[PDB]
């Protein structure tokens, strides 16, 4: 199976309140496992997945020390970018980075990420090939020229096939038992009266993990993908997720309609009838 | 490309000092200015860098609060202030420049470095003593109890240099002591005069000492 | 990331092939640089990116290594290569240097010429009494100097200073000072410095009464 290690970085200025808020959030596959937040009472790297306790004091020190370095760097980045864009000193701005690697079971790098955003807009990213950059405007092009002078892509590539891979391997070695965790969706169908004459049945998927799921409504064999109303998957806040999907039907033959739930933690897709 | 720093600074425990670094021969604003500390005990240590466009700073966690970096963009000048000085701050401080802009590189250019000495001692002139022995005869001079450095020593106003050994100074208590030896043919002393010349600019003193048997 | 140079000093002959090791605490992926530094001067960049020779640097300088083990090579040591050498990594921040490897010329071993000197009248009138012992033009640097007063050893009150390698004859020189009070000085008659060196099993002995 493939696996990924990704970091989600965020630095937000706030002039008139002191230091920019800096954060580093860590992800194995889609599960947050580490977190640094500059605003916490004691701004250190903290575990976010039980299985990270098994890392001794040196790990957390090393990572904390590095965040503080990264924090400093970004603190400056926000000013440079202010200049690049010839912006006032007043208001608050955001830099965001996604950084990390996707590697196969054979330990080869499938994909490497290093993407940047300023104020919610693409700024610059390392291309699929890991050697060239895509800048999204004239400010980003200044960064681009500096990085080519400095040999940044090559460096990243070194980290992405080396460092990134080896830490993921360990991170998997540590909490592999836990990351398999699936919680099967418990499903029910609810009936709702409407005006006019028609009715809408709403198909629920409750208490499932991870969030990937699929809900489909079908009239006795053929699925309706144009009349279906759905909500975005949402957390219950207990660890599990929820989603529903509804459809408008004529009154009398609501039994003719079947709901289908597809989730990786289910031996068989659930097929529900009202 | 050239980075010019100031000369030696003598400063007192608890006090602070500001070292300048004047840069020329390149577009100041396209680069940052790094600073490096070199001292007996830890050798070379990084410290930090400054962005000339906005004064943005990054410090080695080790030097955070001990050093402050500033920039005058217009006069192409970077300054470092080392505060609340201990004897552990006595060292040579370099400013330096990467070959390009970035966090991860080497230093292609160095300033000449500024030596900083942390001491509480007040200026004190040396006492100068002749060393006569008791075929080739060696003679000497004992330069005892001075602060600060340097002290100059010559033989026969420099006429005797080839057979001379002047030794690095050593801290007594908080004062320095050095010695200089000279070798002359034994047939020529005392027949011909052998004098030893000590100067200590700091204390405005110049001393000649004839070595008599 | 600690960068370690094992040998802090190294004895060498002119024409030798010299290899200075540099050891990283983590894989630094060829992000390593080498500097040369001579007394009273700033470091001078020799090599970047592990194997890359900077413009102007002579061809006898060479670099190699991988992961976390690197070497500086000088194929035929010329006299102006006598210096101290530093490696510096830049894979991670903070940029960190090794503690340097200082080269020194080999030469045939030589015994010092030893000379003792009693305190001057001028010093004695002030209550101080320094006895001086010069040990000149010897090699290697390793030497033991004992001060003996009336037969037995004096430990307390000694200051020692060595010179750098002499440019003309590659030797070292040392000065030893035993400072006593006038009162303590006059309690004794026989003052001697003893110099044990690897050139002879017999220690060189200078004295006065």
């Amino acid at each position: 199976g493939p696996h990924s290690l990704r970091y989600f970085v965020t630095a937000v200025s706030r002039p008139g309140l002191g230091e920019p808020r800096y954060m580093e959030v860590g992800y194995v596959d889609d599960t947050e496992f580490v977190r640094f937040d500059s605003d916490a009472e004691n701004p250190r790297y903290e575990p976010r997945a039980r299985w990270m306790e098994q890392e001794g004091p040196e790990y957390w020190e090393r990572e904390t020390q590095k965040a503080k370095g990264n924090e400093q760097s970004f603190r400056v980045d926000l000013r440079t970018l202010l200049g690049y864009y010839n912006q006032s000193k007043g208001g608050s701005h955001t830099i965001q980075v996604i950084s990390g690697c996707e590697v196969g079971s054979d330990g080869r790098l499938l994909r490497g990420y290093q993407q940047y955003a300023y104020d919610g807009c693409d700024y610059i990213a390392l291309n699929e090939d890991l050697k060239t950059w895509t800048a999204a405007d004239m400010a980003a092009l200044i960064t681009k020229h500096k990085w080519e002078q400095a040999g940044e892509a090559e460096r990243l590539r070194a980290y992405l096939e080396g460092t990134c891979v080896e830490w993921l391997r360990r991170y998997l070695k540590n909490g592999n038992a836990t990351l398999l965790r699936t919680d099967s969706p418990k499903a029910h169908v609810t009936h709702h009266s409407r005006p006019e004459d028609k009715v809408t049945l709403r198909c629920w998927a409750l208490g499932f993990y991870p969030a990937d799921i699929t809900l489909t409504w079908q009239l006795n064999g053929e699925e309706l993908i144009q009349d279906m109303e759905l909500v975005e998957t949402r957390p219950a806040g207990d660890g599990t997720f929820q989603k529903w999907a509804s459809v408008v039907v004529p009154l009398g033959k609501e039994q003719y309609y079947t709901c289908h739930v597809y989730h990786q933690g289910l031996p068989e897709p659930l097929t529900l009838r009202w | 490309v050239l980075l010019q720093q100031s000369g030696p600074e003598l400063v007192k425990p608890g006090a602070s000092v500001k070292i300048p670094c004047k840069a020329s021969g390149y577009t100041f604003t396209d680069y940052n200015m790094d600073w490096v500390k070199q001292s007996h005990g830890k050798s070379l240590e990084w410290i930090g860098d400054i962005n000339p466009n906005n004064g943005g700073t990054i410090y080695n966690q080790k030097f955070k609060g001990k050093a402050t970096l500033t920039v005058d963009k217009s006069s192409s000048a970077a300054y470092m202030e080392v505060r609340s000085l201990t004897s552990e701050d006595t060292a040579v401080y370099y400013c330096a420049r990467k070959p390009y802009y970035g966090n991860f590189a080497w230093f292609a250019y160095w300033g000449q470095g500024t030596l900083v000495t942390v001491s509480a001692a007040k200026t004190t002139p040396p006492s100068v003593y002749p060393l006569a022995p008791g075929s080739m005869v060696t003679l000497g001079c004992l330069v005892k109890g001075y602060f600060p450095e340097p002290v100059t020593v010559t033989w026969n106003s420099g006429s005797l240099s080839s057979g001379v050994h002047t030794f690095p100074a050593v801290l007594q208590s908080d004062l320095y002591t050095l010695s200089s030896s000279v070798t002359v043919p034994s047939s020529t002393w005392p027949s011909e005069t052998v004098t030893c010349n000590v100067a200590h600019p700091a204390s405005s003193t110049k001393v000649d000492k004839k070595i008599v048997p | 990331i600690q960068v370690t140079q094992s040998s802090s000093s190294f004895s060498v002959s002119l024409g030798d092939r010299v290899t200075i090791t540099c050891k990283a605490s983590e894989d630094i992926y060829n992000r390593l640089a080498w500097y040369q530094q001579k007394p009273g001067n700033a470091p001078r960049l020799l090599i970047s990116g592990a194997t890359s020779l900077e413009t102007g640097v002579p061809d006898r300088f060479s670099g190699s290594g991988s992961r976390k083990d690197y070497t500086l090579i000088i194929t035929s040591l010329q006299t102006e290569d006598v210096a101290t050498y530093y490696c510096q990594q830049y894979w991670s921040t903070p940029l960190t240097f090794g503690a340097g490897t200082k080269l020194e010329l080999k030469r045939a071993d030589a015994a010092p010429t030893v000379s003792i000197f009693p305190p001057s009248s001028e010093q004695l009138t002030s209550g101080g009494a320094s006895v001086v012992c010069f040990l000149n033009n010897f090699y290697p640097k390793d030497i033991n100097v004992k001060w003996k007063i009336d037969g037995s050893e004096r430990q307390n009150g000694v200051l020692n200073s060595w010179t750098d390698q002499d440019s003309k004859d590659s030797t070292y020189s040392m000065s030893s000072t035993l400072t006593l009070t006038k009162d303590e000085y006059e309690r004794h008659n026989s003052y001697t410095c003893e110099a044990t060196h690897k050139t002879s099993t017999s220690p060189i002995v200078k004295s006065f009464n």
Partner: peptide, 8 residues
């Protein structure tokens, strides 16, 4: 372990 970020 997150990379040490380059300056933009």
């Amino acid at each position: 372990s997150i990379i040490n970020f380059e300056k933009l």
